[PDB]
Design a protein around this ligand. Sequence first.
Ligand code: BCL
Ligand code: BCL
Ligand code: BCL
Ligand code: BCL
Ligand SMILES: CC(C)=CCC/C(C)=C/C=C/C(C)=C/C=C/C(C)=C/C=C/C=C(C)/C=C/C=C(C)/C=C/C=C(\C)CCC=C(C)C
Ligand SMILES: CC(C)=CCC/C(C)=C/C=C/C(C)=C/C=C/C(C)=C/C=C/C=C(C)/C=C/C=C(C)/C=C/C=C(\C)CCC=C(C)C
Ligand SMILES: CCCCCCCCCCC[N+](C)(C)[O-]
Ligand SMILES: CCCCCCCCCCC[N+](C)(C)[O-]
Ligand SMILES: CCCCCCCCCCC[N+](C)(C)[O-]
Lengths: 43, 43, 54, 57
Amino acid sequence: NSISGLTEEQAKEFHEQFKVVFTTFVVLAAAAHFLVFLWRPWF
Amino acid sequence: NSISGLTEEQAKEFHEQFKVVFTTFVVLAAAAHFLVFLWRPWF
Amino acid sequence: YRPSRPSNPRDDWKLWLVVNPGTWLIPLLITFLATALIVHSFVFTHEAYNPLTY
Amino acid sequence: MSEYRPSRPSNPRDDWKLWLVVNPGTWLIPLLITFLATALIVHSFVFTHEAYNPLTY
Ligand code: BCL
Ligand code: BCL
Ligand code: BCL
Ligand code: BCL
Ligand SMILES: CC(C)=CCC/C(C)=C/C=C/C(C)=C/C=C/C(C)=C/C=C/C=C(C)/C=C/C=C(C)/C=C/C=C(\C)CCC=C(C)C
Ligand SMILES: CC(C)=CCC/C(C)=C/C=C/C(C)=C/C=C/C(C)=C/C=C/C=C(C)/C=C/C=C(C)/C=C/C=C(\C)CCC=C(C)C
Ligand SMILES: CCCCCCCCCCC[N+](C)(C)[O-]
Ligand SMILES: CCCCCCCCCCC[N+](C)(C)[O-]
Ligand SMILES: CCCCCCCCCCC[N+](C)(C)[O-]
């Protein structure tokens, strides 16, 4: 047993959905900055 | 156990009501913007 | 050692294998209020977009 | 004739090892909730210079 208490397999199975969710989020997010910049440039 | 301690069924039965309530919420939610746009458009 | 894979929105429900709703459902239904109030304030303050509007 | 030194970890190879320390069942939602607190704040600061606000009369 570790500090969090998960297994290797839970930490690894979890981390998958995390980074999978994360990327599409950070991709979705990266997209909106495009739009805004078209819509209202800055800098 | 799982990290959350729920079971495959509780994880699944719950997710259903969640989707169900979410949808009719993000449908109501979808609806309102229509009217606001009519009552006071923006972009 | 072990590796793995996901595939949602199918695997979506495996959320509640991590996040217990009896502990966390209302806390996150609550933070939508918190969001939905924060939005209203920023538009209700725009005096054109509220019903009272003086 | 004894010591215990830890492996210099190269990321992101060892990235998952976080959840051996952070129990997502307790912290996944605190996290997600704070990315919201962040998003809400950044929103305010750009929502307030009306040039980037979508209402404007
Ligand atoms: C002045 C500013 C600009 C503008 C510029 C930007 C920019 C730039 C960005 C946003 C982003 C967002 N903006 Mg905007 N925004 C404007 C005006 C608005 C108004 C409004 C009333 O006027 C609203 C309601 C919003 C709302 C939002 C959110 C939908 C989003 C931040 C989400 C979040 O909390 O992540 C918090 C993080 C979390 C993890 C919380 C949980 C969120 C969800 C549940 C995560 C999982 C989803 C999964 C990966 C995907 C499922 C979706 C389906 C597949 C479609 N904006 C104007 C036009 N906005 C950001 C974004 O995310 O774009 C994608 C972003 O990058
Ligand atoms: C520019 C300002 C506009 C306007 C634009 C909008 C827009 C745009 C939206 C709202 C929305 C809402 N506005 Mg309005 N609003 C205005 C003025 C007002 C005034 C006022 C004093 O003047 C009030 C009291 C309100 C009040 C409300 C809320 C009822 C609602 C946000 C819900 C929420 O908490 O989600 C937080 C989320 C949660 C999940 C928390 C729990 C909520 C409940 C329990 C969900 C389950 C119910 C189930 C799905 C359906 C069951 C109910 C019945 C079947 C009907 N508005 C003016 C005229 N308002 C939003 C909406 O449609 O919400 C649906 C929305 O999108
Ligand atoms: C004049 C009218 C105003 C306006 C007035 C309002 C008002 C007032 C309200 C909204 C609300 C919303 N507005 Mg609006 N809004 C405007 C223009 C916009 C713009 C824009 C850039 O122009 C955008 C992107 C939005 C978008 C949105 C949504 C975030 C939201 C309605 C549905 C929802 O929550 O789906 C949610 C779906 C997702 C975020 C996608 C992902 C779904 C995931 C996968 C489901 C699982 C989540 C997981 C279990 C848990 C997450 C944990 C928590 C992060 C902690 N509006 C204009 C400028 N809008 C309402 C609101 O606050 O709703 C809560 C509201 O009350
Ligand atoms: C005109 C429009 C505005 C604008 C309006 C908005 C609005 C509005 C929003 C954003 C959003 C974002 N903006 Mg912007 N933004 C502008 C210009 C900028 C500039 C700049 C060049 O000056 C920067 C740096 C950014 C950057 C960003 C991101 C921080 C963020 C998207 C999420 C992501 O992947 O986060 C960061 C990713 C990482 C740090 C990678 C981390 C890798 C780690 C390892 C991941 C694992 C973390 C671990 C598990 C948990 C750690 C602990 C927790 C952090 C507590 N913008 C312009 C000026 N932007 C959105 C937002 O708030 O998102 C939250 C949003 O809603
Ligand atoms: C099988 C088993 C056991 C299990 C399964 C697993 C699962 C389901 C899992 C789940 C997962 C999830 C959902 C995950 C999620 C993820 C995500 C979404 C993530 C995201 C993230 C984000 C981030 C990290 C971000 C961050 C940010 C930052 C740091 C930023 C900051 C900023 C600033 C400060 C700026 C400000 C300015 C002004 C105000 C002006
Ligand atoms: C049988 C058994 C066991 C059980 C049964 C089950 C049950 C009962 C269940 C229940 C469920 C429920 C109720 C569910 C619910 C759901 C819902 C309603 C949900 C909702 C959701 C929402 C969402 C997700 C949203 C989100 C949003 C967001 C994130 C947004 C954000 C925004 C921003 C940041 C912007 C800002 C702006 C300004 C500031 C201007
Ligand atoms: C990835 C988070 C967004 C970073 C915004 C930085 C400003 C860049 C404007 C264009 C956005 N982008 C280069 C991602 O297309
Ligand atoms: C979630 C990020 C939202 C990006 C804002 C994009 C707004 C585009 C609407 C522009 C309409 N028009 C070009 C006629 O002014
Ligand atoms: C999630 C449902 C709310 C999405 C808001 C998107 C605003 C863009 C313009 C929408 C027009 N209406 C849908 C108002 O005709």
